[PDB]
Symmetry: D2
């Protein structure tokens, strides 16, 4: 499977479990949803890509982090966190982690 | 003006100049553009809000960093960088910096 | 500006980290010599961390005493303190070293 | 899973930083004390950085020799090297310290 994401809560140093994440493909107009899943107990979704071959182009994962903090009775600057990325080789592995705090985050292409 | 953004290029330790940044307002499960501007020689847009009172709700600034890198013949993982945030109080200041590399970034509410 | 500014933004509150002790040291042979110590102000800033002596080129270290900052709030942190080592290759320039801070994560960089 | 792992991701390439020297030191009574040194593999990893000797609680630091890493590519960096200090309260636990590296900025955290 060509896409994995995970969330590490930088305030606890522990994974953010049970966080909804969506995957969309950029279309000519707007976006098209490909999948949705929730991070597991290790804050991971190891296989977020649906059962379909990928094409080169732009994609967007959206980590629903607002809800995750809301459940802890915590406020956050971000209602959710979209990350847009480009696939240029269709059978490569893509890894998009999120390092999360209430009022800041980091994301990168992981190994 | 209630919204400032700036971009620091972590690969040079210098500001990212002449980068286009849009501002959108959330409305009916879609987004509406309110303004667009370019970071100055210091990587800043001091006054990104249009000349109209802000309303509470969710907003999205989109840093056009894919284009910034492509002009330098540098590949980037991200075609652009959207950041969504809540504006709960219409008259206070919102500062949304971006720390930028080709394959990673950080954003946060600034002071 | 002063040759050296530092500030701390608490990423968990989205507000500056006030009253955090920060030291400045110069590399001296295989060790370090303290040049100054100061505390972030109410905006999380130390606008002028260099003491009133001429800065020389070479390597330096700021240590953000963040373990203590979190301990006062009865919060645990992975880092007892956070050292950042950097170059001062040119004494005619301004050096800005921000710290973006969480209990189990941080970022630092050369700012403007 | 080892008491201590570290890895480096070069955020300018989106690829691991290979063959980077990393030391590990303990905060002993007589000063900082080297316990081990190693080099990241082709995946940017040192999965087992602890020496064979039993770990105790206390303060430790890893120093990623990134200055050298960039100098081999004829690239400048703000940091001669990057120290990261951290607490080990439970010797039975796994401690992971990734470094996300750019020439003029980095991020670190306690990983899973
Ligand atoms: Zn992962
Ligand atoms: Zn959204
Ligand atoms: Zn693309
Ligand atoms: Zn992966
Ligand atoms: Zn992979
Ligand atoms: Zn700014
Ligand atoms: Zn977009
Ligand atoms: Zn909102
Ligand atoms: Zn501001
Ligand atoms: Zn402000
Ligand atoms: Zn500052
Ligand atoms: Zn120290
Ligand atoms: Zn130097
Ligand atoms: Zn400055
Ligand atoms: Zn690792
Ligand atoms: Zn050192
Ligand atoms: Zn300790
Ligand atoms: Zn690990």
């Amino acid at each position: 499977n060509i896409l994995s994401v995970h969330i590490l809560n930088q305030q606890t140093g522990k994974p953010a479990a049970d966080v909804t994440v969506t995957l969309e493909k950029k279309a000519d107009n707007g976006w098209l949803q490909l999948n949705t899943a929730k991070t597991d107990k290790d804050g991971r979704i190891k296989a977020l890509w649906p059962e379909q071959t990928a094409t080169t182009g732009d994609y967007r994962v959206v980590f629903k982090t607002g809800d995750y903090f809301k459940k802890q009775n915590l406020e956050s600057f971000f209602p959710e966190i979209p990350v847009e990325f480009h696939i240029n080789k269709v059978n490569e592995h893509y890894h998009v982690p999120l390092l999360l705090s209430q009022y800041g985050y980091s994301t990168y292409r992981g190994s």
